[PDB]
Write an enzyme that holds these catalytic residues in place. Sequence first.
Site, PDB file in Angstrom:
ATOM      1  N   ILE A  20       0.815  -1.211   0.000  1.00  0.00           N
ATOM      2  CA  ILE A  20       0.000   0.000   0.000  1.00  0.00           C
ATOM      3  C   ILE A  20       0.853   1.267   0.000  1.00  0.00           C
ATOM      4  O   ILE A  20       0.288   2.333  -0.101  1.00  0.00           O
ATOM      5  CB  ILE A  20      -0.971   0.030   1.193  1.00  0.00           C
ATOM      6  N   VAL A  24      11.816   6.036   0.882  1.00  0.00           N
ATOM      7  CA  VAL A  24      13.214   5.661   0.784  1.00  0.00           C
ATOM      8  C   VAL A  24      13.526   4.676   1.914  1.00  0.00           C
ATOM      9  O   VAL A  24      14.295   3.740   1.747  1.00  0.00           O
ATOM     10  CB  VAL A  24      14.112   6.907   0.796  1.00  0.00           C
ATOM     11  N   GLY A  26      11.413   2.608   3.804  1.00  0.00           N
ATOM     12  CA  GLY A  26      10.317   1.742   4.230  1.00  0.00           C
ATOM     13  C   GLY A  26       9.420   1.258   3.093  1.00  0.00           C
ATOM     14  O   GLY A  26       9.002   2.061   2.255  1.00  0.00           O
ATOM     15  N   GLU A 136      -1.915  -0.225  13.321  1.00  0.00           N
ATOM     16  CA  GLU A 136      -3.319  -0.198  12.996  1.00  0.00           C
ATOM     17  C   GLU A 136      -3.486   0.252  11.542  1.00  0.00           C
ATOM     18  O   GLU A 136      -2.688   1.024  11.029  1.00  0.00           O
ATOM     19  CB  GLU A 136      -3.948   0.731  14.046  1.00  0.00           C
ATOM     20  N   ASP A 179       6.836  16.476   8.091  1.00  0.00           N
ATOM     21  CA  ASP A 179       6.786  15.869   6.763  1.00  0.00           C
ATOM     22  C   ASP A 179       5.364  15.419   6.423  1.00  0.00           C
ATOM     23  O   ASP A 179       5.151  14.315   5.907  1.00  0.00           O
ATOM     24  CB  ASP A 179       7.783  14.710   6.615  1.00  0.00           C
ATOM     25  N   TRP A 182       0.625  14.846   1.544  1.00  0.00           N
ATOM     26  CA  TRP A 182      -0.721  14.284   1.496  1.00  0.00           C
ATOM     27  C   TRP A 182      -0.726  12.765   1.376  1.00  0.00           C
ATOM     28  O   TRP A 182      -1.790  12.163   1.505  1.00  0.00           O
ATOM     29  CB  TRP A 182      -1.624  14.939   0.442  1.00  0.00           C
ATOM     30  N   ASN A 184       0.733  11.254   3.823  1.00  0.00           N
ATOM     31  CA  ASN A 184       0.846  10.900   5.228  1.00  0.00           C
ATOM     32  C   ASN A 184      -0.420  11.274   5.989  1.00  0.00           C
ATOM     33  O   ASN A 184      -0.410  11.350   7.225  1.00  0.00           O
ATOM     34  CB  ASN A 184       2.054  11.544   5.881  1.00  0.00           C
TER      35      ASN A 184
HETATM   36  C1  LIG Z   1       5.290   5.465   3.097  1.00  0.00           C
HETATM   37  C2  LIG Z   1       3.956   5.191   2.857  1.00  0.00           C
HETATM   38  C3  LIG Z   1       3.123   4.956   3.944  1.00  0.00           C
HETATM   39  C4  LIG Z   1       1.706   4.547   3.750  1.00  0.00           C
HETATM   40  C5  LIG Z   1       0.936   4.737   2.631  1.00  0.00           C
HETATM   41  N1  LIG Z   1      -0.345   4.278   2.853  1.00  0.00           N
HETATM   42  C6  LIG Z   1      -0.435   3.774   4.139  1.00  0.00           C
HETATM   43  C7  LIG Z   1      -1.520   3.297   4.841  1.00  0.00           C
HETATM   44  C8  LIG Z   1      -1.369   2.938   6.227  1.00  0.00           C
HETATM   45  C9  LIG Z   1      -2.455   2.607   7.082  1.00  0.00           C
HETATM   46  N2  LIG Z   1      -2.351   2.452   8.412  1.00  0.00           N
HETATM   47  C10 LIG Z   1      -1.129   2.599   8.956  1.00  0.00           C
HETATM   48  C11 LIG Z   1       0.002   2.906   8.247  1.00  0.00           C
HETATM   49  C12 LIG Z   1      -0.092   3.085   6.846  1.00  0.00           C
HETATM   50  C13 LIG Z   1       0.996   3.571   6.072  1.00  0.00           C
HETATM   51  C14 LIG Z   1       0.833   3.918   4.745  1.00  0.00           C
HETATM   52  C15 LIG Z   1       3.680   5.016   5.228  1.00  0.00           C
HETATM   53  C16 LIG Z   1       5.024   5.295   5.361  1.00  0.00           C
HETATM   54  N3  LIG Z   1       5.836   5.520   4.322  1.00  0.00           N
END
Ligand SMILES: c1cc(-c2c[nH]c3cc4cnccc4cc23)ccn1
Length: 328
Positions: A20, A24, A26, A136, A179, A182, A184
Amino acid sequence: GPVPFSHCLPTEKLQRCEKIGEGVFGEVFQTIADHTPVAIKIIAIEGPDLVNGSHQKTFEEILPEIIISKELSLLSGEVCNRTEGFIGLNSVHCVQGSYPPLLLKAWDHYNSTKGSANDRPDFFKDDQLFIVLEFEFGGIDLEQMRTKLSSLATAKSILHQLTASLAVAEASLRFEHRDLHWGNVLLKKTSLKKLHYTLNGKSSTIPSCGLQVSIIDYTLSRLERDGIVVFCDVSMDEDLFTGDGDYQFDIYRLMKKENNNRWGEYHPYSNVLWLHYLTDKMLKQMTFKTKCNTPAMKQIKRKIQEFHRTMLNFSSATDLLCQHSLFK
Ligand SMILES: c1cc(-c2c[nH]c3cc4cnccc4cc23)ccn1
Ligand SMILES: [Zn+2]
């Protein structure tokens, strides 16, 4: 000791992984744990290989994210300063192994459908360490929902939710997100009509317009408790401040100007800057099911325009929430 990948990601969990998101530092997968949706962020650490255009973080360099994630996760259960506008952290592991083929499969599907800016994570050896954060599930990011909101009334709810969440974190933890592009901002459907928060012991409500907002990704974030500051020190970083093509990239430079490149200090004006960038996104780069053709929509648009042109005169999310006409 680290544990095997299989301890955190047994087969049935790996078989339900869907990518999802990314950055860089993660990869993020959605899956099911005990019949419950979760989001798993996986970060390579301590290894010698370049990944996604950088050196890997050390364990020490990842601790700020872990710590800040734990702190913000507490806020839904506190009393005097309470909000659900962050994201729950369920667990943290240190895992050892090469990357599971099943994660590669989901990574491939994402690359095929949305496209990746990352390297295919397929070159790690069986001694590789990773941090695995289970969060979550917070919904879909605001950028992917940019054509999907109902109206500017929805947008107003989103701004209010975000401002309140950041205010509570300011009051409790002297928090700066630093940071909040949109990607995040997560949205999730709720049948709650009114969301609740408590700021310095006073409880208030926000009309949900059918959404709960969650703020994610604390990789650049800063807070403190009892005089101990936890943050990401980007004072020597060069790249972060030379982006263009989007207001997002001005924010980094404006933050640096506000704080004089001292990232340990507390400058909650950074939260105002991010909120301004988000308001901007809502006025320029979003499409709505209901268009600007009724008195009500004309008015809310005018109000969000007035918020855009006045909010940078406030000193914090707290100041905005307490004083700005938009929230009255
Ligand atoms: C890049 C992308 C993402 C990111 C995109 N969509 C997500 C949905 C999530 C839903 N719940 C919890 C965490 C979630 C994290 C993400 C997070 C960090 N670095
Ligand atoms: Zn465990």
